[PDB]
Amino acid sequence: GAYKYLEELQRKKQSDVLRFLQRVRVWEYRQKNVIHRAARPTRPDKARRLGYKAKQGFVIYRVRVRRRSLRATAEERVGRRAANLRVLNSYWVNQDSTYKYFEVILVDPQHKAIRRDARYNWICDPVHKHREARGLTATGKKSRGINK
């Protein structure tokens, strides 16, 4: 599958091609708001290994944050904005000297596709509501420093 090639092309970020894509996409997002929706993940490999599935009930938001942690705060922004959505996880996509750009994956527990497909029904439970608020996300656990 092609997603490997995405992974190892992403591995070389400061290379000419990906720095060019960084520098065009940073500007293009700069024209856009602080928070807004993306039609598709710009790093689909990262989204999958963080748990993305391309079907109804998976929402992509691009969040802009000024330079707690920046990733956690960015997650909290969409947490307040999209209360109905539940924050799954986020990842880094782009940055600027003025702002850092992150892509967050949110899941709707109301769409029957998520409510069915018992692989993901677990997020429908009320106990998972606002994981980012309680630091239960990946960055939340990392900042809390919970490991063995």
Binding site: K4, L9, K12, D16, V17
Partner: protein, 76 residues
Amino acid sequence: KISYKKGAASNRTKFVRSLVREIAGLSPYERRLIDLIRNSGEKRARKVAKKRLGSFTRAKAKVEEMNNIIAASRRH
């Protein structure tokens, strides 16, 4: 028990990384390091590489990789 991650580098992997580094090009510090090699020798090349990096083993790795680039480019 030794994890299969431990075993070795598959042919697909060396192929993939060679193809990536080809299509990526050379970074401005790398574009520097090639000229610094060609001009003032591997000693100063290693010094500058280690200053750019943190440790020395990564420095020798980088210098050896870039000598591979220089050799496989100029002669072929």
